[model samples]
Target: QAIKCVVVGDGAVGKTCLLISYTTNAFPGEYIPTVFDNYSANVMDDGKPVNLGLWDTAGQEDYDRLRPLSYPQTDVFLICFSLVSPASFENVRAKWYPEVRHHCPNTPIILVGTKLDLRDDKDTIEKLKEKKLTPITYPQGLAMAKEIGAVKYLECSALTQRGLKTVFDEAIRAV
Candidate 1:
């Protein structure tokens, strides 16, 4: 089977990391703006080879018009947000969900909370606290999923490769 999954999120919120981690199984060291990178791989699931097509979208405002161009024929959407950034979480409801729904209303979406490793980290907590912000919790993500009517809510850490495979596995299953 072939599956197409598009990842959308706010800029610098680990959207690229989510793709690189899943595709390469290791974290990409630095951040880079991605307009639209199409990745392909043969994944094993249920003892069968499955062709997976992953579309990575740039979260910057400049691509607002161009991003939706890739929405056609998408099987599932991985709506991502950084667990440690409240603003990114807010964008899911504020920006990404509405944008994707506008183009592909019926596409299944899996809400992904990236950088799970830092959600509880000491430095991360202090940095966000200084700005009077905090990391998003699992319950909060679940509630957002329900509010947005997404198929599921998932969390993962690209740096540590934690809960990573299951993220893509669930995406494939969603289709």
Candidate 2:
């Protein structure tokens, strides 16, 4: 069986990380901003290999020009964001969501918050703030996922394998 999932979000929102994590169990030390990077995963579904195809969408100014082809015939849509960046999650809903919803309204959408490798967003932020950095969290992502009837609200961490299982489980139910 082959199932398709599209990841839509802004740049630096860990779209690539989510892609790599699920497809290959690898994480990127440096973020390589992706725009429509298609990834495939092969795994057994009850003793048979089920192929999971993922299309990664760019979350940037140029990519946000309201194109219909950006998302097409998607099974599940992953709304990704960075946990530390306050605007990352909100921007996904405020910007890309309406457009994707217009094209793929029935797609089983899942909201993913990344950077859960070492610790939750709050822990990392406090560490950064002590070094004169800032910290932030977007509870709105949780609120919006529920508001829009998302299939899953997951906080993913490839390094820690936090929500990876939940990803497949949700996709399993959706498919």
Candidate 3:
């Protein structure tokens, strides 16, 4: 069976990169924002074949009306936020969770913290410090996951492929 996994988060939080890296097995170049897209992969999950349909959505406010149009039959959702972007993390609870629940209240959601590689990067940390912000810690992510009733809380780096496989593995299992 095919599982429809829709990804949503604030712009530039690496939602497209997560799907692209997972589906293509390579980090993409450039920073073009995704308005909408779909990626598919066929894989085996514990001896059973599964078709994964990944749906990507634009997170910009300009697309607010157009975005949820893709949510009707979603099986699961990956509500992502950049580990190094506190604003993006804030939006998970402020925006993403409420939006998803309003539309697909019963669908399972996996809270994802993306750009794990930059969470501790000196340059990244320095930049955030300049703004009086810091990387979102694992405990913080887990806390939010629990508050939102997410099925799982995961962190991954698309650039390094760290913890990437388990993100999808858990997503598949959520169904």
Candidate 4:
């Protein structure tokens, strides 16, 4: 069976990186613009082969324009964003959610805070150690996920193994 989910996000937001980690257990150091979608299949759960078509259908700016044509028939819609960049998080509402709502009205959607473990908390701590970095208590990413009615929220870092499987489980369940 081909259980597929389409991963979407702005350019360079770690969608492909997450797929590479989950599917192949390798992260390619060579980064490039995701002008086209990518596919990866694996048996991350119960040894049942799951084919995830981590589709990079549109850049952040063009997601709203493309989803009308691409969203239906999709099993899962993973909305990914980088934790270090506020713009990536902010764009989730401005571009991502509306398109998914428009096209895949009933499809399960997941929110991911990518590069979470790699957050420059050293700088944040220097600035506000007394206050604590938000992730220490409740991640702001979960806040967005809740507000957007995501089926799940996950944290991932491509550079490290921290919380990567949580992402796989979340996306798989979302479908």
Candidate 5:
């Protein structure tokens, strides 16, 4: 049997990047447009084998009406946000959590903060300062995870491969 895990978040929050990095173990050199495709990976959780069907969903406004079409059979959800983008973080509470709950009410969710590499970078900090915003702290993410009743809260960087595997491993365990 396969566990269907769907990913959802705001546009540019690295949802696709997370999938590509997890499955391919390398970051994409060029920008790839949003493509709602399914990726399969077999992983070992503890001693048991798991077939994970990773579903990538478009986060753009244009897909608002069509996105939930992929939610029907999902076993778990990774609700992602960019650590360096405060708006995407806010939308987790304002938009994503509500939508996912509406469709897959009983599914376990992993609240994820993407772009861990950029969170502490000097350039990223300065850029956010210019906009009067700051990178999301770990506590804030954990609090939102609790507020949304998510099973877990985790952060990762696709480029650096930091905390990447654990995200999927936890996804498997959640199922």
Candidate 6:
């Protein structure tokens, strides 16, 4: 059987990289721009081969009207945010969740913290300090997951591949 998984989040928050990394095992050198796109990965779960339909949605307001078309058959959603970008994390609650709920209210959602490798990088930390902001912490991610009714909250570094496979595995199991 096939399962539909949609990835949604603010632009430049690494949604595309997450998908690319999951399917290809390497982070994209340059993020592939998306208005709306789809990818497929075949995997096995519980002795059954599952076809995972991964939908990558453009998070920019410019494509807001165009995004919903990908929602109809979504089985689960990966609502992503950059660990180093507070705004992207906030948008999980502000924009992504509401949008997903409205269209697929019963669909399972997984809150993802992207760019985990940067959360502790000196340069990234310094840059955030300059703005009086800091990377989102694990506790914060967990809290948001609880607050937003997400099935799970997970963090990953697409660059390092840490916890990457589990995120998608969980998505497949979510259904």
Candidate 4 local lDDT, 90-168, one digit each (tens): 8889878886787778888888888766476677545444554333223677789898999998877876857887776
For all candidates in order, the CA lDDT equals: 0.89, 0.70, 0.94, 0.71, 0.93, 0.91
How do all models score by TM-score? 0.94, 0.79, 0.97, 0.79, 0.97, 0.95
Give me the candidate number with maximum lDDT.
Answer: 3
Residue 172 displacement in candidate 5 (angstroms):
0.6
lDDT, candidate 5, 4-117, per-residue tens? 999999999999989999999989869654556889898888998889999999998899999999998899999999999999999998999999999988999999999999
Clashing pairs in 2: 10-59
Question: Could you give candidate 6's per-residue lDDT for residues 47-103 as a string of tens digits?
Answer: 889999999988899988998888998899999999999999999989999999999
Summing lDDT over every window of 10 consecutive residues in candidate 5, give the lowest-scoring window.
Answer: 29-38
Residue pairs clashing, model 4: none
Screening candidate 5 with a backbone cut-off below 3 angstroms (N, C-alpha, C), the clashing residue pairs are none
Give me the runs in candidate 4 sitting further than 4 Å from their true place: 31-35, 62-64, 121-138
How would you encode candidate 3's per-residue C-alpha lDDT over 71-135 as one tens digit per residue?
98899999999999999999998999999999998999999999999987999999999999999
Error of 1 at 169 (Å): 0.2
RMSD of candidate 1 to the truth, in angstroms, is 1.5
- Alpha-carbon error at 35 in model 2, in Å? 8.0
Model 1 TM-score relative to the real fold: 0.94
The lDDT, on a scale of 0 to 1, for candidate 1 is 0.89
**Candidate 4: worst-modelled 10 consecutive residues by lDDT:** 129-138
